[PDB]
Symmetry: C4
Subunit: 205 residues, 4 copies
């Protein structure tokens, strides 16, 4: 659990994300570490990334000297304080999720895998300018009882116990997003599973 092993995984998650069709050189990834977090830097294209580029931001919000952390670092810190169990955070502007956040809609229970994020929906937190404390509060309120949330006019945040499951979850919500937009263009509303049905699935997971 050294710093470089964690930094290598961050980078591999970036590469993997790009390969899955979710990143477009616009996302950012972090892990919980010591009293704060390790995050991707702003400005460096993912493919030029080396272990030594990863940035440490302490619990007070102070970042390592001579390194610029991602421009969206503040809602990574908000996630870690709102959800003590989260150890990794994945943010991207995946097209389908983002398109659903532009309609300012929550993703309802159109598929039983919606339970991976913890309930019968994927919420859409309200718009606030990237990098602000106001955006950070909306994110913290949306992650109180869900592991993933849309961000109106912006994209997605997913958190989990490690980077593997956070990427897995991020991908699953982009599939759910795609399903909802594809079915919504044909019929409105979209048929959903009942709350009873989701409660069984939750128990089963």
């Amino acid at each position: 659990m050294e710093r470089n092993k964690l930094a290598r995984q961050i980078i591999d998650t970036c590469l993997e994300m790009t390969r899955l069709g979710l990143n477009q050189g616009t996302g950012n990834v972090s892990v919980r570490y010591q009293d704060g977090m390790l995050i991707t830097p702003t400005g460096i294209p993912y493919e030029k990334l080396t272990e030594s580029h990863i940035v440490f931001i302490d619990g007070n919000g102070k970042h390592e000297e001579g390194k610029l952390p991602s421009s969206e670092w503040r809602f990574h810190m908000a996630a870690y304080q709102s959800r003590p169990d989260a150890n990794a955070v994945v943010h991207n502007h995946a097209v389908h999720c983002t398109a659903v956040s532009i309609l300012n809609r929550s993703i309802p229970a159109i598929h039983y895998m919606i339970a991976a994020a913890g309930g019968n929906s994927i919420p859409c937190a309200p718009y606030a300018t990237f990098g602000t404390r106001e955006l950070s509060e909306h994110v913290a309120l949306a992650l109180k009882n869900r592991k993933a949330t849309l961000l109106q006019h912006h994209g997605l945040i997913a958190c989990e116990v490690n980077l593997e499951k956070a990427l897995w979850l991020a991908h699953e919500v982009e599939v759910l997003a795609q399903l909802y937009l594809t079915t919504l263009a044909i019929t409105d509303p979209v048929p959903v599973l009942s709350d009873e049905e989701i409660a069984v699935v939750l128990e089963k997971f």
Copy 2:
């Protein structure tokens, strides 16, 4: 026809499936073997899979010691008992097929390749919680006269004589799914080939 050759093929089918855009670390593949089947395990990402991870489940539903078979193993066993000719089963949550299963619609004869699954349609079996005996019965009734079926709010099952044709068929039904949703957004109903026309194509295959 040793166990490892069959296990290697299962793994290659997983890899291939992921490369074709159908799997997203959510499907499961099996082959008929001895008195039961060889299936993919639950919990291991496809890329960490080795021959020794594949799980044997006998005809009584008893799985090898210290191995966890996929969570969806019961409808693989239902397929093998409903269709004696099936020797391999491919299940995934391919986006277009799944989107059609959310509208709870059958895929009708919009293209002459619908005959690869054995008739003039791809049915949609009703919803039941994953991993249950009730889901297993719906699957068994849907595969009685077709080689592939949608599963409402869930995804797809395809079966054939070997893994090569089962993957081939699974991919073909995802193309058919895509065609139907793309045309359905423009016009409802979608023009179909007549039953007479499908009967000629069937004979020809």
Copy 3:
């Protein structure tokens, strides 16, 4: 211009086609040769293809001994007799083109690249069972004044002077297909360029 050099190119065109997202192990490719043509065989997956699998079919429709030519060989021969200038033929079931052939619509002049196929449209020939003489006649009538045509409920045929341009053209018509279906879901009709405008573009090419 030996037989093996031509057979190697056929195979590379198959591989390339699959890489571009047009083939799904359902198309077939040919080249004009001697008094007939060299075509891909039926039944062999593209990746197992070797120079020695390619099939020669003479001008009388007689194929080499102990080799099965593609099941769709007859409209390849129809193309060569209807268009003396065509030296290669590419057929596939590319999703967007096929979706447009299911609406039984011609692709009109929504983009100036429609002139690559020779006019102000990409026609849609009427349905007839694959592999028949009736299908062959519709194809021959559609290619009289165009280098590419849709085939209702089926897919696409493109022909050109060599395999490079036939694949290039096939890809361009799949892009045109995608543009038309994407715009058609928003507005019906789709704005087009006037015949005057297409006549200038034609002259320019």
Copy 4:
């Protein structure tokens, strides 16, 4: 900043563009150089491109002897004269952008990344035959206060300080295009961010 280093980058941008899903052997790339520019040649498929194929066109519009510059070179020269700060130009026929240019619509502020191109929109310049002086004037007027523009019934032009950012920007506008068409099929108008909101984002960048 030798000529070959610049020629190598042009080629890599072509390759990269094709890998991102934007090019289809139809775009063209240039860099500002000496008194004119270095551009891709017409007729050579991107994968056969070598440093020695790149063409130099002076400020008078005279191209190197025995080399044919792209057929769309004139609006590359128009870009360089309309925007002194642009050092690289990327043009392609990316499907979503092109589909939006067929509806002859501007892309409005549906996402905060619209500010990368310099304002609250991505304009759509009017149609004129490829390769003409009339097309060149529309492009010059559209790039006066934006770094990217759609071209009605045609595709996209993006310019920036270097090739890296010009490709990055071109990709971002294709994502914006996709978002707008996907949301437009569900609801018309598409919710946008207010001008006040975009003014803050602009300041922040």
